[PDB]
């Protein structure tokens, strides 16, 4: 069982860590059909999505996708510093798998 996001990320083949150590610059949210998703950017231009729920997600991920969208919204609004993102890099933009926050 991983004790940090880096160890967690290393358990998956199609993942990588981004180190940001910065607050989210922009938060975007959509309810348009087939694009029920969220997008965040950082001021350095890096862009990430929370994927539309699909058949590549198992049932236990569905609730976690919703949680992640919650987390990003509140992170944006409180200007919380994001340390690292773990993302799947076989998507454009890269798809968030995990987030870590520390001051």
């Amino acid at each position: 069982t991983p004790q940090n996001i880096t160890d967690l990320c290393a358990e998956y083949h199609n993942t990588q860590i981004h180190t940001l150590n910065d607050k989210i610059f922009s938060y975007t949210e959509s309810l348009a059909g087939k694009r029920e998703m969220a997008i965040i950017t950082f001021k350095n231009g890096a862009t990430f999505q929370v994927e539309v729920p699909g058949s590549q997600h198992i049932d236990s991920q569905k609730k976690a996708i919703e949680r992640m969208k919650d987390t990003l919204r509140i992170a944006y609004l409180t200007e919380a510093k994001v340390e690292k993102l773990c993302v799947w890099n076989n998507k454009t933009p890269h798809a968030i798998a995990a987030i870590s926050m520390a001051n």
Binding site: E66, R67, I74, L77, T78
Partner: protein, 237 residues
């Protein structure tokens, strides 16, 4: 209690909102760490009021009445065709300068209360517009303010301010009451006060710690409010 303080300032409300409050000189946003700036009350109080109402060296000064602040505004902010008087809640980020500096308060005449780290948006009750010296007696209420929280708070006791007084080490204040009993290391008769710079450092670090702890209180109040919409039942059905 629901006592208010007052500060004439040229920075308009939109800039205050962007900065997250009324900022010391040098500080961009309220929730920046204290390491950004020099935090020293003595230094803050000695500053010249030429152009701006004292806001140097990590503190932002306020007056104890609307009338005081308007008068100060007409002296200092003579030149701005519009400035604002910010109405400000009392809270323990706020020190009575004359009590803390005591007999060494360099402007006892002005009965100033000063905020360590500046004044967060949430602590600002509202503002008056001042157009060509003429106060407009219609107050604008700040929607970021929390009356129930701040009405429950008062300014800091002087005893909480003595250690942060920020006299240089060689100053006789550190060797007299009340300050002697609150003196930082290296200040006063602590060995090598004149040679060490340990004094000015501990002053800074005790200041930064204070702002850290105070920023935690602000975050907890404001950011808890922001999360009071959460309904667990939605997600667990």
């Amino acid at each position: 209690n629901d006592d208010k303080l007052y500060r004439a300032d040229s920075r308009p409300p939109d800039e205050i909102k962007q900065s997250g409050g009324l900022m010391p000189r040098g500080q961009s946003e309220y929730f920046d760490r204290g390491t950004q700036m020099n935090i020293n009350l003595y230094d803050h109080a000695r500053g010249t009021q030429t152009g701006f109402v004292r806001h140097d060296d990590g503190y932002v000064s306020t007056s104890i009445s609307l009338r005081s602040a308007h008068l100060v505004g007409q002296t200092i902010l003579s030149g701005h065709s519009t400035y604002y008087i910010y109405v400000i809640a009392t809270a323990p980020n706020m020190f009575n300068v004359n009590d803390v500096l005591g007999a060494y308060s360099p402007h006892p005449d002005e009965q100033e209360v000063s905020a360590l780290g500046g004044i967060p948006y949430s602590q600002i009750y509202g503002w008056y517009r001042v157009h060509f010296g003429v106060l407009d007696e219609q107050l604008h209420r700040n929607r970021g303010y929390r009356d129930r929280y701040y009405s429950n708070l008062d300014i800091a006791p002087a005893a909480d301010g003595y250690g942060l007084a920020g006299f240089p080490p060689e100053h006789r204040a550190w060797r007299e009451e009340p300050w002697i009993h609150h003196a930082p290391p290296g200040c006063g008769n602590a060995p090598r006060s004149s040679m060490s710079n340990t004094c000015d450092e501990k002053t800074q670090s005790l200041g930064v710690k204070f702002l850290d702890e105070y920023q935690s209180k602000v975050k907890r109040q404001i950011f808890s409010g922001y999360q009071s919409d959460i309904d667990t039942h939605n997600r667990i059905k």
